[PDB]
Symmetry: C3
Subunit: 226 residues, 3 copies
Amino acid sequence: RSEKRVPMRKRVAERLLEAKNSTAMLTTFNEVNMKPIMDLRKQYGEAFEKRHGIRLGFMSFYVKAVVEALKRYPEVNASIDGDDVVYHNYFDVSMAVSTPRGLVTPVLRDVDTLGMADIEKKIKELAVKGRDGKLTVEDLTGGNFTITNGGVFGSLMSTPIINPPQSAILGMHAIKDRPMAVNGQVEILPMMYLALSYDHRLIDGRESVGFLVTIKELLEDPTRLL
Amino acid sequence: EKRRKRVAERLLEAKNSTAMLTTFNEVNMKPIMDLRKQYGEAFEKRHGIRLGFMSFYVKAVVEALKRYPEVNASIVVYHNYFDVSMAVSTPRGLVTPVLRDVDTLGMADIEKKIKELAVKGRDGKLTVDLTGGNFTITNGGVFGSLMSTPIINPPQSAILGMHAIKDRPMAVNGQVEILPMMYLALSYDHRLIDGRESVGFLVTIKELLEDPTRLLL
Amino acid sequence: ARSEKRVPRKRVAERLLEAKNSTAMLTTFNEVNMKPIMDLRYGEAFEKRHGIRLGFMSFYVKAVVEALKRYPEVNASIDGVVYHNYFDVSMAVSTPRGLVTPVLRDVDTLGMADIEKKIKELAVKGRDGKLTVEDLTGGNFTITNGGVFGSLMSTPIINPPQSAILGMHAIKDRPMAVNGQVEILPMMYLALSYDHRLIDGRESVGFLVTIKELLEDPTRLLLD
């Protein structure tokens, strides 16, 4: 079963394979109600735009929530080096962005110290650098966690693959209007499925689930974040 | 304690030799179900075979394959032909009868061949029909499966999993209406197929299936 | 100031890896309507007349036993295929040192209250670190509940040398289609991960559908 063959993206192939072969990868899912964030963004957005020059989007809220969650689950921010578990005192988050040569993992450094606008600007900066092929190796080295968004592609739900030597990875998805049960009443809300794939050798059930629940919580009450 | 050999090895190596991931989605079966009631009986008489869903899936899959060659490829050997393995159940387990050149078959033809293979599987008359296929369509809906993670059948790159059609309250035009929804699950070998592509492939299927009057054109 | 502190479960790490590396693990999902069981819970009476409180876990174990009896492969094991004539079910419970798999033995012979009591017994022994190795050895199947943690849906990992594992989850109110009418029901997602080298599609799905059925009609589970 072979009609045309092109010679080899073989290294990455090895990385992905070993990624899946060297870790006990599992996925835990959940859903978040984007209504609140969308409201904030509706009322404070234009103001934020002018007073900060950058536009207020969702990504900043995710990164902020993720940082908060990381601070409560150090194992998730940790890494496993052959017989040792390396914990991290810093918060560097790899952010998957798409380039014509595939996705790239630009690292957002010390995001715990960045404010909303700063994160919004840097994310932009990296997005453009990726488009122009100006992304430096410095920008692509590091990161304790990864936030990947397939919602841009229309993805409903999926199983993200861990990017070694990281322990977990969070996958954002498409925001769809969904009939939901709020107060024994059914109301349509802009729901989104979160998918966290984690290396079970380090992170366990209660923790991955806790981590994800935390994100859902903070995101459903932005005030308690922003 | 108390009291599939090669297949066991195949499945293991299948999962051990590929970076398998799964992307899910949902499709609204209402439209297809409508043509089916409106032209079905006619189709039945004028074509002798009954119009079912499977033909639409195969057709949509072929269309999708034509737009995502990597998905029709193998690890990288690309394919100029469209042979689709179709998992059918025999008393000795599931079997992968191959539907050849489905891009050239019309609705009725696919409906007949699928039948043919289904029966041959029941009678154990399926010939080593079992060799080939660039993709695989597996349907667990017959078993009542809501959603699941299909396993890739080497040396294929991806596999699509059909599921049970359940009535689900949905949001259509800021209004909630019950529609016969179905979850699609595409497991793909990430060494060859990436995110945007698997998701694209699946979105394409959803689209074509939600508008049969476009698939046929 | 910016340090990568390497702290010196490695066995467990090996187990989990080999667990995922030695089996063709796949996951099949489904949903169950908890309304009926919640209605029986007939609870206060049970409480007094049996001293223990009637919860959900007993119903799950009972349903699982029933399902096991119909799908022996799921109760089997692959040794390098050992079937089991007994029904011992590992029940994942959480201890400060992680989850533990206390085994419930011969659950097919235990009645509602008995299962309710033993589950309790084991839960406490786990809290006090009094869980014996005897309690932790054996089990043909495993029931794990992440609902306690708020988990919506997930992919459970098989505990070798077992063949499958059932994952309970959070009970959320969900708008559903009942009789062409939309009604909110306390739905729950079930996730069954199974070793495909032994258990196939029709069987895992059948097993799971069986559980859904029995659970949606407990007055076919109160006494068998």
